[PDB]
Design a protein around this ligand. Structure first.
Ligand SMILES: *[C@@H]1O[C@H](CO)[C@@H](O[C@@H]2O[C@H](CO)[C@@H](O[C@@H]3O[C@H](CO)[C@@H](O)[C@H](O)[C@@H]3O)[C@H](O)[C@H]2NC(C)=O)[C@H](O)[C@H]1NC(C)=O
Ligand SMILES: *[C@@H]1O[C@H](CO)[C@@H](O[C@@H]2O[C@H](CO)[C@@H](O)[C@H](O)[C@H]2NC(C)=O)[C@H](O)[C@H]1NC(C)=O
Ligand SMILES: *[C@@H]1O[C@H](CO)[C@@H](O[C@@H]2O[C@H](CO)[C@@H](O)[C@H](O)[C@H]2NC(C)=O)[C@H](O)[C@H]1NC(C)=O
Ligand SMILES: *[C@@H]1O[C@H](CO)[C@@H](O[C@@H]2O[C@H](CO)[C@@H](O)[C@H](O)[C@H]2NC(C)=O)[C@H](O)[C@H]1NC(C)=O
Ligand SMILES: *[C@@H]1O[C@H](CO)[C@@H](O[C@@H]2O[C@H](CO)[C@@H](O)[C@H](O)[C@H]2NC(C)=O)[C@H](O)[C@H]1NC(C)=O
Ligand SMILES: *[C@@H]1O[C@H](CO)[C@@H](O[C@@H]2O[C@H](CO)[C@@H](O)[C@H](O)[C@H]2NC(C)=O)[C@H](O)[C@H]1NC(C)=O
Ligand SMILES: *[C@@H]1O[C@H](CO)[C@@H](O)[C@H](O)[C@H]1NC(C)=O
Ligand SMILES: *[C@@H]1O[C@H](CO)[C@@H](O)[C@H](O)[C@H]1NC(C)=O
Lengths: 199, 172, 50, 167, 49, 37
């Protein structure tokens, strides 16, 4: 992919083009007789050419000011990018961020920084689920006249049986009293089903 | 800088090539606006469509889901937001993404979060009932899942009443 | 002052190979970088002094 | 009046190009399609939507597919109607570990400009004339030195976070 | 000389306009980055922040 | 340095940034997230 490392090439090209534009305005006369200072110092009256030299100074001084302003703007942008990179190094590399899409697409596991010219590259190792199958679910289960709710997981349907499994990976387990907690009766929950809770 | 006078055009060169440096800066700003919109709305790779049956366990998303009877397929809140909000050398360039495409991205983000929860942001869109995904968010904020199921009618009414007041809040 | 081209800098023996009809050498920024000697045929680099 | 932009699929692929007259009508220019962003010459319109390749404007993009450049309304993606139901849950049975790269600029070249040498260039008369314009040379120097020391802090805040060099 | 005076005055105005547009574009870009972070953390998920 | 414009060298060389990256990697592969806290 050619557009992989463009953001750093763009910065270096912007710097090079700013330098070239600054060095190109040196050949500009800005409405004067010429741009070569030695010729103006050797083709006019020394006491009279002062007002002519004043025009070249303003043309070059204001160009330097525009260059400095554009450099300040680019420095602000690069400092924002560097603050983002430092936050990403502290949160994605030095830890495991729970922020979505901040340390890569998917559930972030870990990151590895890589040195780059005038930049940094993060290798975001993420967790992407795949091969999903759909089942029938229920908010609660009524066995002993009392509604049971899963402690950590979701009730799924075997087609003819019911299981409890974690919400990020299909691992069926028998619905026992250790996987569920009882709270309230059964006439207050919508969608509750009947199934035995193993003791 | 010159308009129509030809005597100025050749005289502009002796001052400098600033017209070239400035036009390259405005093009960067112009392409930045198209990148800003894509970074916000183009986060999904698939356009999820809302189911034909609009039942979500008592919750009512009519004020935020697209209205097929209205033009531009905007929602009432988007309608209110839209209703409330060639010269001498200067031109206005049209955005790369039209308002109908941004509205479609918003519909995809909205239809996905109501039918798949947060699963479509990390990978494939895993279908899940809305009272089921609402219990996961309650379990995330620090309250058990039974609090939602035992009060689903109350929470649904508080949600529907709060969304209805958003239009009044943004209008008044 | 090399045959009219007047400047200021350090003159060093370069390894460049100019064409027999070329006299001056310029870089990307359109500035004098090398000049052929008029008497001999050697090529001398021109660099900003300090 | 308007700007002329050339749409090219790259010289490595083909030499065909399409000119886009931005903001003008197709009847006032000296095969043609009046796009909402301007007149497009050299690209035929097609109703088969695809992903945007070459941005044009107003939801229209250009591409090279078949030996000709075609213009089309960009498609935001494939339609995916999730099978929502009152009691349908989707649980993934497998997973895949993926690695995604993210490149971020941290710093740029620390430049410095000599005021007298750039504005004058070893001219005694010019150097004395700079004083009449004040100390503008000092402001530019302090501004550029502030940027230079800022780049060293950018690299320091990003990489120098460890207290010990682990082997 | 009059044309050079008019060109210089109008050119500096366009430069000031471009600088102001750059500043406002930086502001809008910061706001858009904040909105994109808010779209992924608040909409595409649940934020503990 | 050609026309008054000078390019100052960075304080941290490319070899030192490489050492910082190597330290971060060796810490994250052998110590997890504990070396950051
Ligand atoms: C979860 O997904 C992974 C990745 O697709 C599955 O691993 C894959 O398992 C199949 C069957 O064992 C492998 O196919 C075999 O490949 C060997 C060559 O390595 C070939 O000689 C065999 O005849 C057979 O075709 C496949 O290579 C393997 N993929 C990887 C990347 O290792 C895994 O089985 C899935 N688990 C479940 C429970 O679905
Ligand atoms: C329900 O899950 C079981 C696995 O725990 C599947 O396998 C059946 O298990 C029962 C024991 O309870 C056996 O009597 C059957 O003979 C098993 N089936 C087969 C094909 O070996 C069972 O298939 C699942 N139910 C459905 C409807 O798929
Ligand atoms: C789950 O079990 C309950 C209780 O065993 C069932 O409720 C019974 O429903 C029948 C038919 O409507 C009534 O005649 C009984 O009086 C009910 N029992 C009680 C205690 O109220 C319920 O129908 C079962 N649900 C399913 C889906 O099997
Ligand atoms: C969901 O909300 C919409 C809008 O708030 C409800 O539509 C209203 O229905 C009442 C009674 O039929 C009408 O008097 C209002 O004029 C309707 N509002 C609008 C904007 O048309 C709708 O009834 C609610 N419930 C469902 C299930 O859609
Ligand atoms: C200009 O004159 C000088 C002086 O004769 C030439 O330099 C001689 O070049 C020959 C051939 O390489 C040498 O054998 C002599 O030793 C050189 N003499 C000196 C004093 O350097 C030079 O070649 C002439 N330039 C041209 C273009 O013919
Ligand atoms: C999910 O449950 C809702 C509510 O019970 C169902 O919506 C009902 O559908 C029937 C048949 O079309 C209508 O007569 C009712 O008026 C609907 N109720 C409401 C409140 O809208 C919906 O059909 C169920 N979905 C599935 C797939 O079973
Ligand atoms: C599961 O999804 C498939 C398509 O993804 C659908 O055809 C089916 O009806 C859904 N439900 C079950 C129980 O398979
Ligand atoms: C301008 O373009 C529109 C759209 O095709 C067309 O209807 C109209 O006639 C054009 N105007 C002129 C003066 O050609």
């Amino acid at each position: 992919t050619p557009s992989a490392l463009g953001k750093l090439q763009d910065v270096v090209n912007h710097n090079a083009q700013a330098l070239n534009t600054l060095v190109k305005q040196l050949s500009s006369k800005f409405g004067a007789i010429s741009s070569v200072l030695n010729d103006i110092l050797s083709r006019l009256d020394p006491p009279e050419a002062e007002v002519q030299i004043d025009r070249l100074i303003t043309g070059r001084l204001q160009s330097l000011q525009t260059y400095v302003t554009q450099q300040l703007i680019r420095a602000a942008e690069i400092r924002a990018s560097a603050n983002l990179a430092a936050t990403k190094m502290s949160e994605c590399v030095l830890g495991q961020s729970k922020r979505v899409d901040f340390c890569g697409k998917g559930y972030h596991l870990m990151s590895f920084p890589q040195s780059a010219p005038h930049g940094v590259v993060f290798l975001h190792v993420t967790y992407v689920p795949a091969q999903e199958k759909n089942f029938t679910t229920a908010p609660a289960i009524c066995h002993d006249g009392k509604a049971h709710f899963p402690r950590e997981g979701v009730f799924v349907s075997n087609g003819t049986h019911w299981f409890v499994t974690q919400r990020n990976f299909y691992e069926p387990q028998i619905i026992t009293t250790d996987n569920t907690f009882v709270s309230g009766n059964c006439d207050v929950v919508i969608g509750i089903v009947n199934n035995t809770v193993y003791d | 800088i010159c308009g129509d006078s030809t005597e100025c055009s050749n005289l502009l060169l002796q001052y400098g090539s600033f017209c070239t440096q400035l036009k390259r800066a405005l093009t960067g700003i112009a392409v930045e606006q198209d990148k800003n919109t894509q970074e916000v709305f183009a986060q999904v790779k698939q356009i999820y469509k809302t189911p034909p049956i609009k039942y979500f366990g008592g919750f009512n998303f009519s004020q935020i889901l697209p209205d097929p009877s209205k033009p531009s397929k905007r929602s009432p809140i988007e309608d209110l937001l839209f209703n409330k909000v060639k010269f001498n050398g200067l031109t206005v360039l049209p955005p790369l993404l039209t308002d109908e495409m941004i509205a479609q991205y918003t519909s995809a983000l909205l239809a996905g979060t109501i039918t798949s929860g947060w699963t479509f942001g990390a990978g494939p869109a895993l279908q899940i009932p809305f009272p089921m995904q609402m219990a996961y968010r309650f379990n995330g904020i620090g309250v058990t899942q039974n609090v939602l199921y035992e009060n689903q009618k109350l929470i649904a009414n508080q949600f529907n009443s709060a969304i209805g007041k958003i239009q009044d809040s943004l209008s008044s | 002052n090399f045959n009219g081209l007047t400047g200021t800098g350090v003159l060093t023996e370069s390894n460049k190979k100019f064409l027999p009809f070329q006299q001056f050498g310029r870089d990307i920024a359109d500035t004098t970088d090398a000049v052929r000697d008029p008497q001999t045929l050697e090529i001398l680099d021109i660099t900003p002094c300090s | 009046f308007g700007g002329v932009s050339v749409i090219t699929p790259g010289t490595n692929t083909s030499n065909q190009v399409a000119v886009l007259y931005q903001g003008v009508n197709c009847t006032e220019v000296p095969n043609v399609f009046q796009t909402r962003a301007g007149c497009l010459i050299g690209a035929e319109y097609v109703n088969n939507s695809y992903e945007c390749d070459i941005p044009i404007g107003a939801g229209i993009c250009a591409s090279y597919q078949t030996q000709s450049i075609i213009a089309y309304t960009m498609s935001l993606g494939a339609e995916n109607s999730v099978a929502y139901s009152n009691n349908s849950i989707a649980i993934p049975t497998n997973f895949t570990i993926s690695v995604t790269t993210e490149i971020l600029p941290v710093s740029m070249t620390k430049t410095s400009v000599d005021c007298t040498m750039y504005i004058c260039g070893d001219s005694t008369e010019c150097s004395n004339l700079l004083l009449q314009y004040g100390s503008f040379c000092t402001q530019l120097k302090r501004a550029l030195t502030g940027i230079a020391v800022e780049q060293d802090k950018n690299t320091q805040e990003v990489f120098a976070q460890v207290k010990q060099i682990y082997k």
